[PDB]
Amino acid sequence: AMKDHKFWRTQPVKDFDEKVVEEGPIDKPKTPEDISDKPLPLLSSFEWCSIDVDNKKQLEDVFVLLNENYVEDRDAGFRFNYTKEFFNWALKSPGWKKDWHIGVRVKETQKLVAFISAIPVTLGVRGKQVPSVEINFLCVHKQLRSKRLTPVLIKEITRRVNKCDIWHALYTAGIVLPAPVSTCRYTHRPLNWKKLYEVDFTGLPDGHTEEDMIAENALPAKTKTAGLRKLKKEDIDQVFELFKRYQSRFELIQIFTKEEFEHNFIGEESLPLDKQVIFSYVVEQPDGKITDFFSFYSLPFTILNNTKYKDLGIGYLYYYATDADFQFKDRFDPKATKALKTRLCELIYDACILAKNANMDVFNALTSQDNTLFLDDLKFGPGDGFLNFYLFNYRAKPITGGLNPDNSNDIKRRSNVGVVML
């Protein structure tokens, strides 16, 4: 765990158990010109390539690979089900480039075999602004693994970014790597219960029998909060200052511009609900005031472990904000937490409703932010996965990830991880 890292042993990363006293860049300053203007050396038969999301075929290949090779053989029937919609949303954040959506195609077969994505973001690390990139969607074909190509991809994506004068990045990973800045856990709230035990994504306790299952997970068919409308372009100016105001409590965050805020929460118009990705909602008051906002996105799995099904609806809790405790000076005040807690339970309660209504079968959260105030209550069941947050070329003191030493939620201090990854 601590020394089994050939590649990361050479990278600008915080090392295991490092007592960071002064936060900041790791490497000594460099400039884009003292950076190779030519891609790294690939296996003799392989070749590099960019991915134009606007290109039907090019993007078509990407999700095929990710749908076939994203699961790592612990079959329960699942295969991710990335859609063109999903990636059109995820890969076209303001500032994106085809260069940055890198892949590897075999010189002759032209079949894409590897992929890794980078999109520009400004990060807030304990008040310091850090021009960065966000890395995600790293994937290699199953008959090309354990052959150490990933580090090549990581070196090639870094080069291309460095060549644009961007020297840092935030990436998340399950596996433990040199320097997590924080760790959070995945909790899952069932919506189409029966359908889950059916597909094996949920266990069934003998002494709480199937009947009681569905009976407990039950949920209204319509929301319950006054003014619960839905996000519209007109709301932006206002919801952005509310979101900004609320996110200031965290130590790690993405400093959205109104453009990336807009792009992020208002997706493509005219998309069947059978193909929508982002769901942003907002609470307005007679006053005309927006005081709440929350969002979740959709990423389903294809199926094979069930005869009646072939799909599984999954929703993830994204960003949200409220003005409950804006009256209090200290976030952790006993009463300040009073407000904030009930509201989030309300909002998230409706978010679960909108989710099943949108056809999701299970809602996923991550102990990050204050999802800990409502996770257990609204009954989100803690799962196998854990996520680690990393900062490339940046030294920062550990950030509370919403976990207690025994992996139990920490209703106490909650979390300071303000970002949420796709």
Partner: peptide, 8 residues
């Protein structure tokens, strides 16, 4: 990250 996770 990855996602769906599991539990028993």
């Amino acid at each position: 990250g990855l996602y769906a996770s599991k539990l028993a």
